Amino acid sequence: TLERSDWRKFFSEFQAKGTIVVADERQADRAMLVFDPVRSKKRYSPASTFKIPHTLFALDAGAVRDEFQIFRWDGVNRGFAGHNQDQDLRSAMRNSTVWVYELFAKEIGDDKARRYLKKIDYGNADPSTSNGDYWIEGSLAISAQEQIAFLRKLYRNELPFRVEHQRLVKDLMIVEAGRNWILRAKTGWEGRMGWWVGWVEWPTGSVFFALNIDTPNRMDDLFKREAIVRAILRSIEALPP
Ligand SMILES: *C(=O)N1C[C@H](NOS(=O)(=O)O)CC[C@H]1C(N)=O
Ligand SMILES: [Ca+2]
């Protein structure tokens, strides 16, 4: 992995402290690019980025049939606007609707989660929790480098789930596309730090990214997750201007 310490200008452009790993598969044998290589190997809670593997778990276990199943909302104003309504997989992914995945969690075995996480070697694969949900308030942790490794498995259909379920999750991740490019990504926010992970597919190959930053300013820092990544991806012609 090649260290791009010059990428500090992008984090400073938005007054943030964080890391990013970028794996550029356009052409061949390009070095993996990293800002802050030590932090890039530090494990953090995946927070809402866990909805990527969590959806694979729920599909593989039968907690959700497909993209057309509607999950009826219990009528309790429990999050924000997009959470307080009936959900399908796409709305839950786009709005980061926590209560759908809480429902998936209880239906999935607590032992199944362990067997799942270990079968894919996701971070430390430890869903031990004391109170909250194990993917945000628990032992489960994964580094940026480990997110890249996981996303490439999903991209290559190499994960030990039905290829149909891998394809569905990759479709649910779509946040933007042009005629020549497709961006698939998911944000996460743990409270004190935050994520944006995913990749953008071009004709000549795909560019994977995993960024985490600290979020001392809480909500006012959330835009920085995408803003830093987009500036870096644009700098390497991985997103249009
Ligand atoms: C996921 O990290 N979360 C769910 C929700 N949306 O997060 S997102 O904007 O990063 O997709 C609120 C923040 C967070 C949580 N508190 O569970
Ligand atoms: Ca290539």
Side-chain angles (χ1 to χ4, degrees), residues 77-109:
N77 194 330
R78 117 193 345 102
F80 306 118
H83 304 163
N84 298 326
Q85 64 201 25
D86 282 355
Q87 305 277 324
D88 51 24
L89 280 179
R90 193 163 300 265
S91 78
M93 199 70 170
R94 279 172 175 168
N95 295 263
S96 219
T97 307
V98 182
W99 63 259
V100 171
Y101 288 83
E102 298 181 326
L103 184 155
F104 292 166
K106 286 182 177 180
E107 185 149 346
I108 297 168

XYZ file of all heavy atoms in Angstrom, residues 77-109:
268
model
N -42.893 6.934 16.857
C -41.963 7.935 16.350
C -40.581 7.709 16.959
O -40.234 8.320 17.975
C -42.503 9.337 16.671
C -41.797 10.448 15.893
O -40.616 10.345 15.541
N -42.529 11.528 15.628
N -39.779 6.829 16.363
C -38.582 6.349 17.040
C -37.278 6.872 16.453
O -36.228 6.735 17.095
C -38.577 4.810 17.060
C -37.448 4.131 16.309
C -37.717 2.642 16.127
N -38.787 2.152 16.990
C -40.024 1.908 16.576
N -40.350 2.111 15.301
N -40.931 1.462 17.440
N -37.309 7.495 15.283
C -36.082 8.022 14.722
C -36.272 9.390 14.111
O -36.584 10.363 14.806
N -36.082 9.473 12.807
C -36.351 10.681 12.055
C -37.391 10.373 10.990
O -37.943 9.271 10.936
C -35.055 11.237 11.481
C -34.005 11.437 12.522
C -32.809 10.752 12.464
C -34.237 12.290 13.591
C -31.847 10.932 13.441
C -33.280 12.474 14.578
C -32.083 11.794 14.502
N -37.652 11.366 10.136
C -38.835 11.327 9.279
C -38.883 10.064 8.424
O -39.899 9.356 8.393
C -38.872 12.575 8.401
N -37.787 9.756 7.732
C -37.759 8.591 6.862
C -37.841 7.260 7.580
O -38.028 6.235 6.920
N -37.702 7.250 8.904
C -37.820 6.018 9.670
C -39.251 5.719 10.085
O -39.577 4.563 10.389
C -36.948 6.090 10.928
C -35.508 6.389 10.657
N -34.646 6.836 11.634
C -34.774 6.296 9.523
C -33.445 7.013 11.113
N -33.494 6.692 9.833
N -40.105 6.731 10.100
C -41.426 6.627 10.709
C -42.488 6.378 9.637
O -43.380 7.193 9.393
C -41.716 7.886 11.524
C -40.730 8.086 12.671
O -40.260 7.125 13.281
N -40.412 9.342 12.966
N -42.364 5.219 8.994
C -43.237 4.808 7.897
C -42.883 3.379 7.507
O -41.811 2.872 7.850
C -43.107 5.735 6.686
C -41.731 5.716 6.057
C -41.456 6.951 5.240
O -42.050 7.999 5.474
N -40.546 6.839 4.281
N -43.801 2.735 6.788
C -43.537 1.389 6.304
C -42.261 1.371 5.465
O -41.903 2.358 4.818
C -44.724 0.876 5.496
C -45.876 0.414 6.377
O -45.725 0.406 7.620
O -46.930 0.049 5.822
N -41.555 0.246 5.507
C -40.242 0.136 4.895
C -40.171 -1.060 3.955
O -40.812 -2.090 4.185
C -39.163 -0.005 5.967
C -39.183 1.090 6.989
C -38.458 2.316 6.527
O -37.439 2.223 5.844
N -38.967 3.483 6.905
N -39.388 -0.911 2.886
C -38.858 -2.043 2.135
C -37.336 -2.002 2.235
O -36.767 -1.113 2.872
C -39.365 -2.059 0.683
C -39.176 -0.731 -0.054
O -38.293 0.073 0.312
O -39.928 -0.504 -1.026
N -36.665 -2.995 1.641
C -35.211 -3.045 1.776
C -34.569 -1.773 1.247
O -33.641 -1.243 1.865
C -34.629 -4.270 1.065
C -34.705 -5.624 1.787
C -34.094 -6.745 0.930
C -34.035 -5.571 3.152
N -35.056 -1.249 0.115
C -34.402 -0.057 -0.421
C -34.601 1.152 0.487
O -33.647 1.893 0.745
C -34.874 0.271 -1.832
C -33.921 1.303 -2.429
C -33.979 1.437 -3.904
N -33.663 0.212 -4.622
C -32.451 -0.097 -5.084
N -31.424 0.713 -4.874
N -32.280 -1.226 -5.751
N -35.821 1.373 0.992
C -36.020 2.505 1.899
C -35.199 2.344 3.173
O -34.642 3.322 3.690
C -37.500 2.679 2.244
O -37.928 1.738 3.209
N -35.103 1.117 3.693
C -34.317 0.911 4.906
C -32.841 1.194 4.660
O -32.166 1.790 5.507
C -34.510 -0.507 5.439
N -32.324 0.785 3.498
C -30.934 1.077 3.159
C -30.714 2.570 2.937
O -29.731 3.137 3.427
C -30.529 0.287 1.911
C -29.037 0.153 1.727
S -28.332 -0.947 2.971
C -26.683 -1.119 2.312
N -31.621 3.224 2.208
C -31.443 4.637 1.883
C -31.622 5.530 3.102
O -30.898 6.515 3.270
C -32.432 5.053 0.802
C -32.017 4.689 -0.593
C -33.146 4.980 -1.556
N -32.740 4.756 -2.935
C -33.577 4.709 -3.965
N -34.882 4.842 -3.770
N -33.110 4.501 -5.186
N -32.606 5.234 3.936
C -32.867 6.060 5.102
C -32.089 5.606 6.325
O -32.102 6.306 7.344
C -34.366 6.066 5.399
C -35.161 6.725 4.300
O -35.501 7.898 4.389
N -35.439 5.982 3.242
N -31.385 4.476 6.227
C -30.686 3.874 7.360
C -31.659 3.629 8.511
O -31.441 4.053 9.648
C -29.500 4.733 7.802
O -28.394 3.922 8.161
N -32.748 2.930 8.196
C -33.830 2.677 9.143
C -33.411 1.574 10.106
O -33.414 0.390 9.748
C -35.107 2.298 8.400
O -35.393 3.299 7.416
C -36.278 2.204 9.389
N -33.083 1.962 11.338
C -32.480 1.029 12.286
C -33.456 -0.076 12.684
O -33.060 -1.238 12.838
C -31.964 1.795 13.517
C -31.295 0.839 14.493
C -31.005 2.899 13.084
N -34.741 0.249 12.853
C -35.638 -0.727 13.470
C -35.900 -1.934 12.581
O -36.268 -3.000 13.095
C -36.962 -0.075 13.887
C -37.847 0.507 12.801
C -37.963 1.826 12.462
C -38.794 -0.199 11.976
N -38.901 1.984 11.466
C -39.421 0.756 11.148
C -39.158 -1.544 11.848
C -40.390 0.409 10.207
C -40.115 -1.887 10.900
C -40.722 -0.913 10.098
N -35.706 -1.795 11.267
C -35.790 -2.943 10.377
C -34.679 -3.937 10.689
O -34.914 -5.149 10.764
C -35.736 -2.476 8.907
C -35.605 -3.666 7.972
C -36.968 -1.646 8.564
N -33.451 -3.443 10.874
C -32.328 -4.337 11.118
C -32.337 -4.878 12.541
O -31.892 -6.009 12.770
C -31.018 -3.619 10.774
C -30.909 -3.479 9.271
C -31.545 -2.434 8.605
C -30.248 -4.442 8.513
C -31.490 -2.326 7.213
C -30.183 -4.343 7.129
C -30.806 -3.280 6.484
O -30.747 -3.179 5.112
N -32.864 -4.111 13.495
C -33.133 -4.674 14.812
C -34.070 -5.868 14.701
O -33.844 -6.909 15.329
C -33.717 -3.601 15.733
C -32.770 -2.431 15.983
C -33.345 -1.383 16.925
O -34.577 -1.161 16.901
O -32.561 -0.781 17.692
N -35.113 -5.742 13.874
C -36.009 -6.868 13.617
C -35.261 -8.028 12.967
O -35.480 -9.191 13.324
C -37.172 -6.400 12.741
C -38.326 -7.328 12.367
C -39.558 -6.488 12.072
C -37.992 -8.210 11.168
N -34.380 -7.734 12.007
C -33.555 -8.785 11.419
C -32.651 -9.427 12.464
O -32.400 -10.636 12.421
C -32.696 -8.233 10.278
C -33.477 -7.802 9.067
C -32.876 -7.031 8.085
C -34.802 -8.165 8.908
C -33.588 -6.633 6.963
C -35.516 -7.764 7.796
C -34.909 -6.999 6.824
N -32.137 -8.625 13.397
C -31.181 -9.139 14.372
C -31.823 -10.196 15.259
O -31.269 -11.283 15.450
C -30.620 -7.993 15.213
N -33.004 -9.899 15.799
C -33.646 -10.843 16.706
C -34.072 -12.114 15.982
O -33.966 -13.214 16.537
C -34.831 -10.175 17.398
C -34.392 -9.185 18.459
C -35.565 -8.568 19.182
C -35.087 -7.639 20.282
N -36.228 -7.025 21.007
N -34.537 -11.995 14.737
C -34.911 -13.187 13.986
C -33.692 -14.050 13.676
O -33.759 -15.281 13.768
C -35.643 -12.796 12.702
C -36.181 -13.976 11.907
C -37.455 -13.637 11.152
O -38.058 -12.579 11.449
O -37.856 -14.424 10.265
N -32.571 -13.426 13.305
C -31.323 -14.163 13.134
C -30.847 -14.659 14.492
O -30.984 -13.967 15.510
C -30.254 -13.280 12.462
C -30.683 -12.854 11.057
C -28.916 -14.002 12.390
C -29.807 -11.763 10.464
N -30.293 -15.867 14.523
C -29.724 -16.369 15.763
C -28.553 -15.514 16.225
O -27.759 -15.022 15.422
